């Protein structure tokens, strides 16, 4: 079988959804990419979609600090 090389790309998302509600996302990741920018990555609950939230929002601010802990 084979497996995608992975990692070889630039930015997972260059756009952000600036107004995501903590209510519509079940899981996030903090994309602190040295390659691109500080990105907020989230998975929608009902939509299940992988989207990115803008890091300048309010609830992401608390997320930022605590996400560094994994």
């Amino acid at each position: 079988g084979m497996k995608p090389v992975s990692l070889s790309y630039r930015c997972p998302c260059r756009f952000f959804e600036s107004h995501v509600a903590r209510a519509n996302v079940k899981h996030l990741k903090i994309l602190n990419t040295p390659n691109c920018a500080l990105q907020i990555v989230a998975r929608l609950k009902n939509n299940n979609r992988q989207v990115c939230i803008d890091p300048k929002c309010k609830w992401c601010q608390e997320y930022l600090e605590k996400a560094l802990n994994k």
Binding site: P12, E17, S18, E62, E65, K66
Partner: protein
């Protein structure tokens, strides 16, 4: 976001998602306590 924070993992670089979504509309809120600038 959960209560005091969220506590999620820190991603260096990964391929769970390679392309940006259809999310074109982007305008961050500000305060959300008095008002969030966007009401709903």
């Amino acid at each position: 976001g959960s209560m005091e924070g969220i506590s999620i993992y820190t991603s260096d670089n990964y391929t769970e998602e390679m392309g940006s979504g259809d999310y074109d509309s982007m305008k961050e809120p500000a305060f959300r306590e008095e008002n969030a600038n966007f009401n709903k």
